[PDB]
Design a protein around this ligand. Structure first.
Ligand code: NA
Ligand code: NA
Lengths: 144, 144, 144, 144
């Protein structure tokens, strides 16, 4: 199941990432945009954004592997909680260029905001799935 | 936001509920099928199934209110964990009769299996949303 | 495993419960103090405190049974998240009057703050265990 | 807050670790035993045990830093869930040699079992705290 890095770069945030990542003008933000090919189709589009101030070093090779493992490796003990929001959205132009969308009109979009022990929003992920390629499992634990 | 009870009954399980609820032939299962009207449209279809042996008493009035609150009220201390599985599915005939599906072809389907302290699968819920009417939030808590 | 209700009453909050429950002077708060006898010893002291404004009706019989089930029954759908803090504390005078503390000097104290969908702190529980009678299990779920 | 590595080694499992880690005779297990000095006292004793087959490489320097971050870095995407069990135990001889236990007789013991996506128990941690130095926070998330 191959992973392709489409965009990857370190720049100031766009206005959307200023809102999503609570970042300023003068914050250096890593942007990584990838697609996943679950043979033989490109079906998920993964967009990560996180502050360089906390993760100063990154490479194209780390993105073709796991950004999660890399990030946990560098500062997993400072990461406190994440908040997930899963909705469905119309496909966008970016979605149709990069994924094999067949006769699909919508996506399942998982958004995830990762915060540090000190309370700051440090990372933002937007994971866009074709409908047939989305499955989310969890608990859930009940009682007192 | 009105709630309408379409089916409601106490019978032995169909073959699908035998699989979903790990129930036998000679188990009495409550089935409740409801739709939610988030004005002014019917947009969610909620199917609950649970054993009468654990919840012997039920009414149409409890279903028009909250089955969750009722169930927690009777045996919330025995409920241990739930497991959730969220996928997307094509709409079915039952979906089109009961919900206002406009020009919609798919649904977000949340399935939830609730287990007791003694380890048994006791309840099964299948909650079917029109795509624009689905939003799921959670944590997620990270670190050691 | 018998449950004994020692105090139970509806009054304005003490200064400690003002802090613990974020309640004012003119808020009516239910206080329930119970001990659990895990035969044949009294070993846990359970203190619950919650606003009457949200749970207007209560009885001694509900406390000898389950306050959790009762509360979930009345407003479980409005309850959003709880936050738990588990520490160890020296035993207090109240602990020695009401529990069989043998040659025990400390307690395991579980504190739990329950919040509503609207964001307000609605309930506070303080559960004090003798050391040998404390066991807490959980997950914990890992990965992306 | 300094970290001291007392034992560290790669051997077959003792009979206790065979039970705790579900390991055989012919499984190579890393054992790391550390104490934490929260100035100016040694107050926590951390025992980690995990299979070399999954983490082939390790050093004394990684243990003086974070084993969690290291492990997440190597295989965080394969880690599925953990299960935690927190109880209180009498102090042992190992506890009194390595920690400053003053006039303390008991410990808060946090045990944690980490499993992989494939279902196998892969790691076991036993974290022993002096009573005054234990605080555990969590959620807890409620409702349907
Ligand atoms: Na569609
Ligand atoms: Na003691």
């Amino acid at each position: 199941t191959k992973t392709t890095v489409h965009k990857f770069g370190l720049e100031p945030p766009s206005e959307l990432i200023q809102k999503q990542l609570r970042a300023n003008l003068d914050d250096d933000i890593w942007e990584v945009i990838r697609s996943r090919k679950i043979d033989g189709e490109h079906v998920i589009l993964d967009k990560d954004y996180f502050f360089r101030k906390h993760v100063p070093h990154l490479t194209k090779e780390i993105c073709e592997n796991s950004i999660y493992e890399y990030i946990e490796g560098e500062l997993g003990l400072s990461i406190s909680y994440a908040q997930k929001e899963i909705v469905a959205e119309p496909c966008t132009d970016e979605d149709r260029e990069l994924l094999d969308l067949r006769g699909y009109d919508h996506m399942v979009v998982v958004r995830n905001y990762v915060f540090l022990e000190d309370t700051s929003l440090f990372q933002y992920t937007e994971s866009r799935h074709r409908l047939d390629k989305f499955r989310f499992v969890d608990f859930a634990r009940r009682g007192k």
